[PDB]
Amino acid sequence: AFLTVERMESPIDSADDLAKQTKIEYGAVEDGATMTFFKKSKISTYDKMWA
Amino acid sequence: LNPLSPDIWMYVLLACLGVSCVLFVIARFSPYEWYNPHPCNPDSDVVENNFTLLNSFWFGVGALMQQGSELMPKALSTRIVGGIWWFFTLIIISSYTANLAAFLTVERMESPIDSADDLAKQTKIEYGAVEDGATMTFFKKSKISTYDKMWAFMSSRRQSVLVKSNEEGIQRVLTSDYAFLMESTTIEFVTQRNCNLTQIGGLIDSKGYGVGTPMGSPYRDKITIAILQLQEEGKLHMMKEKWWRGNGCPEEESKEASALGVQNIGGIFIVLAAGLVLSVFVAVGEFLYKSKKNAQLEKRSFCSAMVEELRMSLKCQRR
Amino acid sequence: LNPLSPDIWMYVLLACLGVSCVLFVIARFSPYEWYNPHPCNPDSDVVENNFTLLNSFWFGVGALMQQGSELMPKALSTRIVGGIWWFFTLIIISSYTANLAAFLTVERMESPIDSADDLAKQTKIEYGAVEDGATMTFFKKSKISTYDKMWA
Amino acid sequence: TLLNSFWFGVGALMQQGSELMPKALSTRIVGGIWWFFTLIIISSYTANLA
Ligand SMILES: CCCCCCCC/C=C/CCCCCCCC(=O)O[C@@H](COC(=O)CCCCCCCCCCCCCCC)COP(=O)([O-])OCC[N+](C)(C)C
Ligand SMILES: CCCCCCCC/C=C/CCCCCCCC(=O)O[C@@H](COC(=O)CCCCCCCCCCCCCCC)COP(=O)([O-])OCC[N+](C)(C)C
Ligand SMILES: CCCCCCCC/C=C/CCCCCCCC(=O)O[C@@H](COC(=O)CCCCCCCCCCCCCCC)COP(=O)([O-])OCC[N+](C)(C)C
Ligand SMILES: CCCCCCCC/C=C/CCCCCCCC(=O)O[C@@H](COC(=O)CCCCCCCCCCCCCCC)COP(=O)([O-])OCC[N+](C)(C)C
Ligand SMILES: CCCCCCCC/C=C\CCCCCCCC(=O)O[C@@H](COC(=O)CCCCCCCCCCCCCCC)COP(=O)([O-])OCC[N+](C)(C)C
Numbered sequence: 001a002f003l004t005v006e007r008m009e010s011p012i013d014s015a016d017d018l019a020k021q022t023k024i025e026y027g028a029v030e031d032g033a034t035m036t037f038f039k040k041s042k043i044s045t046y047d048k049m050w051a
Numbered sequence: 052l053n054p055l056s057p058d059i060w061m062y063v064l065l066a067c068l069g070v071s072c073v074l075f076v077i078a079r080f081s082p083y084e085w086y087n088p089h090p091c092n093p094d095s096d097v098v099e100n101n102f103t104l105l106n107s108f109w110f111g112v113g114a115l116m117q118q119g120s121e122l123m124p125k126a127l128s129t130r131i132v133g134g135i136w137w138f139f140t141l142i143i144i145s146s147y148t149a150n151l152a153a154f155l156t157v158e159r160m161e162s163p164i165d166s167a168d169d170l171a172k173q174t175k176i177e178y179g180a181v182e183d184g185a186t187m188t189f190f191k192k193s194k195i196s197t198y199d200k201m202w203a204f205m206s207s208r209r210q211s212v213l214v215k216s217n218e219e220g221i222q223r224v225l226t227s228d229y230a231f232l233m234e235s236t237t238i239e240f241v242t243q244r245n246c247n248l249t250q251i252g253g254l255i256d257s258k259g260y261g262v263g264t265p266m267g268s269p270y271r272d273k274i275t276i277a278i279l280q281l282q283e284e285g286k287l288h289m290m291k292e293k294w295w296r297g298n299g300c301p302e303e304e305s306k307e308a309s310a311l312g313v314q315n316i317g318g319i320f321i322v323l324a325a326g327l328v329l330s331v332f333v334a335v336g337e338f339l340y341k342s343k344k345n346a347q348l349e350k351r352s353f354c355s356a357m358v359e360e361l362r363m364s365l366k367c368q369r370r
Numbered sequence: 371l372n373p374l375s376p377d378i379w380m381y382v383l384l385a386c387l388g389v390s391c392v393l394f395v396i397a398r399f400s401p402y403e404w405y406n407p408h409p410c411n412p413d414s415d416v417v418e419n420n421f422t423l424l425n426s427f428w429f430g431v432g433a434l435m436q437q438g439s440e441l442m443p444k445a446l447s448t449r450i451v452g453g454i455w456w457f458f459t460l461i462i463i464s465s466y467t468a469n470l471a472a473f474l475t476v477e478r479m480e481s482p483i484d485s486a487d488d489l490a491k492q493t494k495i496e497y498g499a500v501e502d503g504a505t506m507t508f509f510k511k512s513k514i515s516t517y518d519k520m521w522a
Numbered sequence: 523t524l525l526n527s528f529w530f531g532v533g534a535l536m537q538q539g540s541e542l543m544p545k546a547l548s549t550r551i552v553g554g555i556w557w558f559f560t561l562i563i564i565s566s567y568t569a570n571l572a
C-alpha cells in the first residue's frame with residue numbers, strides 16, 4: 001500500500017472543483033477579458049465563480 | 052525482473068559476493084567456529100571448519116531464496132552476519148513481491164510512427180490526404196524540411212495515397228496499412244465513436260473554420276460579432292459537446308482478467324533451461340578435474356576417466 | 371487454479387519432473403557428491419550418494435512449495451541445479467500470490483449503464499417507454515440535451 | 523510418534539519446516555499434499571489481507 005499510493009494530487013482539477021472548494025481563493029486581473037468573461041456568464045458553474 | 056531497478060539487481064548480486072566474502076573471513080579467525088569433528092572421538096586433536104568458500108557462498112545464495120541451507124553458523128560473530136543477511140533478504144523480497152502486482156500486466160505497443168517526423172522517414176506506412184483540400188495544399192506550398200519530404204512522397208504516388216474524401220480515408224486506415232492526415236476536429240469525432248483509431252502525433256499547423264462571405268459582403272462583420280456572441284455565452288462549446296461526444300471508447304482500464312501465461316511469466320523457463328545446461332558443463336568439469344587429480348597417482352587421462360565412467364553406468368556401485 | 375493459465379501449470383509440472391531428473395543424473399555423475407558416510411569411523415573406502423531418484427523428486431517438490439527438503443546438494447555441479455530451481459520457484463510463487471490478489475478483489479458485475487447519460491452515449495442497449503404515457507411526453511418536451519438525445 | 527506427527531502438521535503449516543522429513547513414499551505423498559494445502563491457504567490469506 002505504501003509503494004503504490006500517488007505523487008500528490010491537487011485539491012482542484014477543474015473549475016467546478018474550485019467552485020465548490022471555497023478554501024482556495026479565486027483570482028483574475030482588474031478590467032481584463034478574464035473577469036469580463038465571468039461577469040457576462042450564466043452557465044451556473046462560472047456564475048458561482050463570479051459570485 | 053522489473054519491480055526492482057537494474058542497479059538494485061546489481062547491488063543485491065554484489066551483496067551476495069560481499070557478505071559471503073565477509074562470512075568466509077570471519078569464520079576462519081573466529082576461534083569458536085572451529086568445532087570438533089568425529090562424533091565418536093577420543094576427544095581430539097583435530098579442528099575442522101565447515102565454512103569453505105564454496106559453503107560461504109552457498110549460505111548467501113541459500114538464505115536469499117528463503118530455502119535455508121544445510122549449515123547454520125555457530126560462533127556469535129558469524130551469527131550476526133547471518134542475522135543481518137536474513138533481514139536484508141527479508142526486505143528485498145517483501146519489496147519485490149509487493150511491487151510485482153503492478154509490473155505483471157503486459158501493455159500495448161507504441162505506434163511505429165509518433166509524429167510527422169517519424170512518418171516522413173519511413174516507406175512502409177503509406178500516407179496521404181484528401182486531394183484539393185486545405186491539407187494537400189498545405190504540403191503543396193510548404194518549404195520546411197519535413198513537410199516537403201511528405202509532399203515528395205505524395206506527388207510520386209498521387210493516384211494511390213491521395214483519397215478523394217474523408218470516408219475513403221478512414222476506410223483505408225482500417226482496410227490497409229496507411230496513415231491519413233486529417234484536420235484536428237474530425238479526428239476528435241472519429242476516434243471517439245470508432246475505437247481502433249487514434250490521433251498519432253500533435254497538430255502540424257493551426258488554422259480554423261469560418262463562415263465564408265464574398266469579397267465585399269457586409270455579412271462578414273455581422274457574423275464576426277455574432278460568432279463571438281455565442282462563444283462567451285458558451286453556445287459554441289455546447290453545440291460541439293453535443294456532437295463530438297459519443298461512445299467514448301472507455302476500454303483503457305479493463306482489469307477484469309489476465310491469468311498469467313507464457314507471455315507474462317514466460318522467461319524463467321529460459322533462465323531455468325540456461326541454468327541446467329550450465330550445470331551439465333560443470334559436471335563435466337568435476338568429472339575431469341577429479342580424474343586429473345586421480346591422474347596425479349596413475350595414467351594420463353583415459354584410464355582414470357573410464358573407471359569413473361563405468362561405475363556411473365552401474366548406478367549402484369558403492370565401493 | 372486461475373492466476374496461472376492452464377499451460378503454465380503444465381510447464382511447472384514438466385519442469386518439476388524435468389529439473390528433478392537432471393539433478394539425479396548430475397549427482398551420480400559428479401565425483402564430489404560421493405562422500406564417505408563415516409566421519410568418526412576410518413573403516414574403509416565406503417562411498418554413498420544421497421540422491422536416489424525418489425530423493426531427487428523430493429528436492430524439486432520440496433523447494434517448489436517453499437518447505438525445503440531433508441537433503442541438500444554438496445558438489446558445485448548440483449548446487450547450480452539446486453540454486454536455479456530455488457530462483458525458479460521464488461518467482462513462480464511470487465507471481466502466483468501477487469496475481470491471486472487481483473482475482474479476489476475485482477467486482478461483482480457492473481452494468482454498462484449507471485445513469486441516463488450513460489445510456490445516451492451507449493447506443494448498443496436500446497431505449498423504451500410506453501406509447502402515450504407521461505414518460506415519452508417528458509422527453510418530447512425536454513431540451514436539456516441529455517434527454518433530447520434520448521428522444522432523438 | 524503422535525507427538526512428532528502433529529509437529530509435522532503444525533510445522534508445515536507456518537512454513538517453517540520441522541526437524542523430520544518423511545521417508546517411505548506413502549508418507550511422502552501425505553507430506554507432499556499437505557504442503558500444497560498450506561501453500562494455497564496462506565497464499566489466499568496473505569492476498570486477501572490487504
Ligand atoms: C517484520 C520484520 C521483523 C524484522 C526483525 C525486527 C526488526 C526491528 C527493527 C526496528 C526498527 C525500529 C525503528 C522504528 C522504525 C520507524 C522509522 C524510523 O525510526 O527509522 C529511522 C531510523 O531507524 C533505523 O534506521 C532502524 C534500523 C533497523 C535495523 C534492524 C536490524 C535488526 C536485524 C536483526 C539482527 C540479527 C542479530 C542476530 C543475533 C543472533 C529513520 O526514520 P525516517 O523514516 O527517515 O523519518 C524521517 C522522514 N523524513 C526524512 C521525511 C524527514
Ligand atoms: C557456458 C559456460 C560453461 C562453463 C564450463 C567450464 C567450467 C569448468 C568448471 C570449473 C570449476 C568446477 C571444477 C573445479 C573445482 C571443483 C569443484 C569444487 O568443489 O572444488 C573446489 C571449488 O571451490 C571453489 O572455489 C568454488 C568457486 C566459487 C563458487 C561460486 C562460483 C560462482 C557460481 C556460478 C554462478 C556464476 C554464473 C556465471 C555466468 C553464467 C573446492 O572444493 P574441494 O576443496 O575440492 O572439496 C573437496 C571435498 N573434500 C575435501 C571433502 C574431498
Ligand atoms: C547469486 C550470485 C550469482 C550470480 C550469477 C547470475 C548473474 C547473471 C546476470 C547476467 C545479466 C546480463 C544482462 C544482459 C544479458 C542479455 C542477454 C539476453 O538477452 O538474455 C538471455 C537470457 O539470459 C540467460 O539465459 C542467463 C541465465 C543465467 C543462468 C545461470 C544461473 C547460475 C546459478 C548460480 C547458482 C548459485 C549456487 C551457489 C553455488 C555455490 C537470452 O535471452 P533471449 O535473447 O531473449 O533468447 C531467448 C530466445 N528467444 C529470443 C526466441 C525468445
Ligand atoms: C504455484 C504452485 C505450484 C504447486 C505445484 C504444482 C501444481 C500443479 C497443478 C496443476 C493443475 C492443472 C489443472 C489446470 C488448472 C486450470 C483450471 C482447471 O482445469 O481445474 C479444473 C480441475 O482441475 C483440477 O482439479 C486440478 C487439481 C490439481 C491438484 C495438484 C496437486 C499436486 C500436489 C503435489 C503432489 C505431491 C507428490 C509428492 C511426491 C514426492 C476445474 O476447472 P474449473 O475452474 O472448475 O472450470 C469450470 C468453471 N465453471 C464451473 C464456471 C464452468
Ligand atoms: C563494510 C564491511 C564490508 C561490506 C561488504 C558488502 C556490503 C555492500 C554494501 C553496499 C554495496 C552497494 C552500495 C550502494 C548503496 C549504498 C549507499 C547508498 O547509496 O545508499 C544511500 C546513501 O545516501 C545517504 O543518505 C548517505 C548516508 C550514509 C550513512 C553512513 C553509511 C555507512 C553506514 C555505517 C554506519 C556505522 C554505524 C553503526 C556501527 C555499528 C542512498 O543513496 P542516495 O542516492 O543519496 O539517496 C537518494 C537521494 N534522495 C533521498 C534525494 C532521493
Ligand SMILES: *[C@@H]1O[C@H](CO)[C@@H](O[C@@H]2O[C@H](CO)[C@@H](O[C@@H]3O[C@H](CO)[C@@H](O)[C@H](O[C@@H]4O[C@H](CO)[C@@H](O)[C@H](O)[C@@H]4O)[C@@H]3O)[C@H](O)[C@H]2NC(C)=O)[C@H](O)[C@H]1NC(C)=O
Nearest residue numbers: 160175176221222223224225226227228229230246247248
Ligand atoms: C490487428 O492489427 C493488424 C495490423 O494492421 C490488422 O491486420 C490488418 O487487417 C486488415 C483487415 O482488417 C488487412 O486488410 C487486408 O487488405 C486488403 C487490401 O489489400 C483488404 O481489402 C482486405 O479486406 C478488408 O478488411 C476489412 C476488415 O477490416 C473487411 O471488412 C473488408 O472486406 C476489406 O476489404 C484484407 O483484410 C491488413 O492487410 C492487415 N495488415 C497486416 C499488416 O496484416 C488486424 O486486422 C488487427 N486485428 C484486429 C482484431 O484489430
Ligand SMILES: O=S1(=O)NCN(C2CC2)c2ccc(F)cc21
Nearest residue numbers: 185254255256257258259260261
Ligand atoms: O488561420 S487563423 O485565422 N490565423 C492563424 N491562427 C493562429 C496562428 C495560429 C489561427 C488560430 C486559430 C484559429 F482558429 C484560426 C487561426
Ligand SMILES: C=C(C)[C@H]1CN[C@H](C(=O)O)[C@H]1CC(=O)O
Nearest residue numbers: 028029030031032033034035036
Ligand atoms: C495583463 C493583462 C491585464 C491582460 C493581458 N492579456 C489579457 C487581455 O489583454 O485581455 C489580460 C490578462 C487576463 O485576462 O488575465
Ligand SMILES: C=C(C)[C@H]1CN[C@H](C(=O)O)[C@H]1CC(=O)O
Nearest residue numbers: 499500501502503504505506507
Ligand atoms: C401504464 C401506463 C401507460 C401509465 C401508468 N402510469 C403512467 C401514467 O399514467 O402516466 C404510465 C406509465 C409510464 O409513464 O411509463
Ligand SMILES: *[C@@H]1O[C@H](CO)[C@@H](O)[C@H](O)[C@H]1NC(C)=O
Nearest residue numbers: 225226244245246247248300
Ligand atoms: C476493432 O478491431 C477489429 C477491426 O475492425 C474489429 O473486429 C473490432 O470490432 C473493432 N472494434 C470496434 C469497436 O470497432
